[PDB]
Design a binder for these strands. Structure first.
Ligand SMILES: [Mg+2]
Length: 758
RNA sequence: UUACUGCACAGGUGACGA
DNA sequence: TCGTCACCTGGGCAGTAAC
């Protein structure tokens, strides 16, 4: 039982001698660091300034002398290590500090990719993809009670377009509408300048500008987004352009695949271990062994959660390892009770797509047959319904109509429904050129708005999807079916849980940030989703209808206390029963908000029961990766030479970093998509220190299970539904709040049990 | 906006302190 | 106002759908 990390032990001195002076105002710290530059390392923490001498000779420093022992206060040397790593690698310029980040000295993957695909173009030399490395000094706990410092190595790719904007023009590339950034960024300057309206003299005309509406061709460059890469390259190359991307993708796989990443990490550790790292001129650190996660000795640092089971009945008896397998065999969890066995579904679509939409609806409702075993039965037999009646609502509108498409859809819905009686759901087909129009003329959001006001949830669909090859279409229709059923109040599946306490509530919060352009300040909206322990099963509760950023903490507390009150009433908790409340988000709550939440839930449940409360953050973008050297991977596809997910930990692997923190693996070899897919990064699950329920392993496993509860897809989500559904709610409600004639009135009436946000 | 996955880039932001 | 440690969210593009 071993998982290898991307980090190395750092052998530090036991002790370091330091000078301390009280400095209750931290505004002084910056000038003082400058004054003692070169001779002293300086660090402010907890009202006080800490000085570690790094070189002999003045200036002098007044203060109390103290021995800072590493085992007890590892933050001091962790911080010194950020800078010492920089100093240790003088030939690699920092592109960022804390963590030290830098570029490979030679390697340039576009040149290599071109050669390997046998492509060429004069300008290609001005498109650079360079490996980017970061070394992050992190505190971890090899076992409870003991801290150490590790150096964690992470790799990504710098994409840059150095080309002059002038050159890109004459090559036939249309630069209109592309974002542009400053070549040299003033200290504490923005990068984004805006979009390209046109070029004049030595002068770019910018719309959506962030500052001035003009800048010289010479002080600006295209932003190195994938969008600009593809737009420039396909113009200069197509259709050889895909050939270069695959080859670039192959090159990058050379640094990001499991074995190849493990090798790059090894080589980086060798390089840093070659010389001592000077913490001062007389005090050294040494980079040591690869940090592992194991159960050797007094370490209990790795476990494997059981496989999540998808459950399709209350008796626990009907279950599967995979959502579709189970759904296909058993039908949905709620089919014995599902109330509406003959849904009427409005189908809103551009009249000119009529035949394509019929083909799609036929495939959806009645299946694709045995040649497409992924979607044979169709929606009706899949979900155990009697029939589906489509009410056709053609719309006279063209993809060219960018300004009045939304008006036409809504006019057509209103006229059709006036004379049609009640519809239970709707499907809205959209042109690709309309899907991303601004919200004031976007038919997605206008039709979603109108139909949700009327209490009619929709599943929308873009024509490129409607037209998918049958091999892709069968999977499309799995996902479409599951969300549509849930939109009709259905519960497709649950995930196993064996209840140990009398009740458990999990609430999540999710954030969305909206603006009409990148110039405009993003406005924040929030959402809240609740999940309850059932008997053998987790059950999705209700969902917020207000979106609310200011006061989100009051909303969390209002939602938990109202829910605890109703759960108690439903279940009639007995004296001495234990109730557990778990909160999830992608960021940690404030201590003061945890205190207020704990106080109000405790007072609401009363002294008759025992309450356990945990506050959990789920992080995706941290410096930790898990390597399972025992995993050979799987056949990229049956039956190739290439392998996918080589060295990928199993789904459900949980490693201990520290008392409050676990790493959770979610993307197993099975789930990994391709040979060139990188070694996955696990989720970091952190418990808030003020939590009263402390078992982070159990909370990591619960988070795992909730990834499987997503009804947007047959495949699991990247984050538990408690957070993920909250983000979809927040985005939709925040958008809707700007749409004329939107009302939320039906969200808690007709739509109370509809999962309208999927 | 069927989704999952990945990546790039940009924007910054959060928590903890005194 | 700060210092310090940390990483989240939006927009877009490309490959594939846990046996
Ligand atoms: Mg959806």
């Amino acid at each position: 039982r071993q998982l290898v990390s991307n980090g190395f032990e750092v052998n530090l001195p036991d002790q370091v001698e330091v000078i301390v002076r009280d400095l209750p105002d931290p505004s002084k710290v910056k000038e003082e660091r400058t004054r003692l530059m070169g001779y002293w390392f300086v660090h402010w923490f907890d009202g006080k300034l800490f000085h570690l001498r790094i070189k002999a000779g003045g200036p002098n420093v007044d203060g109390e002398h103290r021995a800072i022992r590493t085992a007890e206060h590892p933050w001091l040397l962790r911080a010194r290590l950020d800078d010492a790593l920089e100093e240790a690698l003088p030939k690699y310029a920092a592109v960022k500090k804390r963590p030290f980040t830098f570029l490979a000295q030679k390697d340039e993957l576009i040149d290599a990719a071109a050669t390997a695909a046998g492509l060429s173009h004069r300008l290609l030399n001005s498109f650079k993809v360079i490996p980017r490395f970061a070394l992050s000094p992190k505190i971890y706990e090899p076992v409870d009670g003991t801290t150490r410092v590790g150096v964690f190595v992470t790799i990504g790719m710098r994409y840059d377009i150095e080309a002059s904007l002038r050159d890109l023009l004459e090559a036939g590339i249309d630069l209109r509408g592309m974002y542009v950034v400053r070549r040299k960024r003033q200290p504490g300057e923005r990068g984004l300048l805006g979009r390209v309206r046109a070029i004049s003299d030595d002068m770019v005309q910018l719309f959506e500008e962030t500052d001035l509406a003009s800048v010289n061709v010479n002080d600006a460059k295209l932003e190195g987004s994938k969008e600009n890469f593809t737009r420039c390259l396909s113009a200069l190359l197509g259709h050889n352009y895909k050939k270069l991307l695959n080859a670039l993708d192959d090159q990058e796989a050379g640094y990001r695949t499991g074995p190849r990443f493990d090798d790059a990490v090894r080589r980086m550790g060798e390089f840093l271990a070659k010389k001592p790292i000077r913490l001062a001129d007389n005090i050294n650190a040494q980079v040591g062994d690869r940090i592992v996660f194991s159960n050797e000795g007094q370490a209990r640092n790795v476990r494997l959660a059981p496989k999540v089971e998808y459950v399709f009945d209350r008796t626990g008896a009907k279950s599967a390892e995979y959502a579709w397998r189970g759904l296909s065999q058993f039908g949905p969890f709620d089919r014995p009770s599902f109330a509406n066995r003959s849904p009427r579904i409005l189908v809103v679509y551009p009249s000119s797509t009529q035949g394509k939409v019929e083909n799609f609806l036929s495939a959806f409702r009645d299946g694709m047959g045995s040649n497409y075993s992924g979607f044979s039965k169709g929606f009706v037999d899949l979900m155990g319904l009697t029939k589906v009646e489509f009410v056709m609502c053609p719309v006279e509108v063209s993809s060219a109509d960018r300004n009045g498409a939304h008006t036409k859809y809504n006019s057509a819905i209103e006229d059709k429904l006036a004379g049609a009686g009640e519809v239970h759901a709707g499907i809205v087909v959209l042109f690709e050129d309309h899907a991303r129009l601004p919200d004031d003329r976007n038919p997605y959001i206008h039709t979603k708005s109108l139909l949700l006001t009327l209490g009619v949830p929709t599943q929308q669909v873009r024509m490129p999807t409607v037209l998918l090859e049958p091999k892709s279409l069968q999977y499309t229709l799995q996902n479409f079916s599951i969300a549509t059923y849930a939109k009709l109040n259905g519960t497709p599946w649950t995930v196993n849980h064996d209840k140990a306490i009398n009740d458990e509530l999990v609430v999540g919060m999710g954030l969305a940030e909206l603006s009409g352009s990148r110039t405009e300040k993003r406005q924040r909206f929030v959402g809240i989703t609740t999940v309850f322990a059932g008997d053998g099963s987790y059950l999705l509760g209700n969902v917020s209808k207000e979106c609310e950023y200011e006061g989100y903490s009051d909303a969390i507390r209002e939602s938990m206390t109202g829910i605890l009150r109703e759960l108690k009433k439903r279940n009639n908790w007995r004296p001495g029963d234990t109730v557990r409340v778990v909160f999830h988000a992608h960021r940690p709550l404030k201590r003061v908000d945890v205190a207020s939440i704990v106080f109000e839930c405790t007072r609401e449940i009363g002294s008759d029961q025992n309450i356990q409360m945990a506050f959990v953050t789920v992080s995706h973008d941290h410096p930790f990766v898990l390597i399972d050297r025992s995993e050979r991977g799987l056949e990229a596809y049956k039956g190739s030479t290439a392998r996918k997910g080589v060295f990928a930990p199993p789904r459900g692997a949980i490693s201990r970093v520290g008392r409050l923190t676990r790493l959770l693996a979610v993307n197993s070899p099975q789930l990994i998509k391709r040979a060139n897919t990188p070694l996955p990064t696990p989720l970091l699950v952190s418990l808030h220190p003020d939590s009263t329920f402390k078992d982070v392993d159990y909370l990591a496993e619960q988070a795992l299970k909730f990834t499987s509860l997503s009804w947007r897809s047959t495949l699991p989500a990247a984050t538990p539904v408690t957070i993920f559904y909250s983000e979809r709610i927040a985005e939709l409600l925040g958008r809707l709040k700007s749409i004329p004639n939107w009302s939320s009135a039906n969200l808690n009436i007709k739509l109370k049990w509809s999962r309208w946000f999927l």
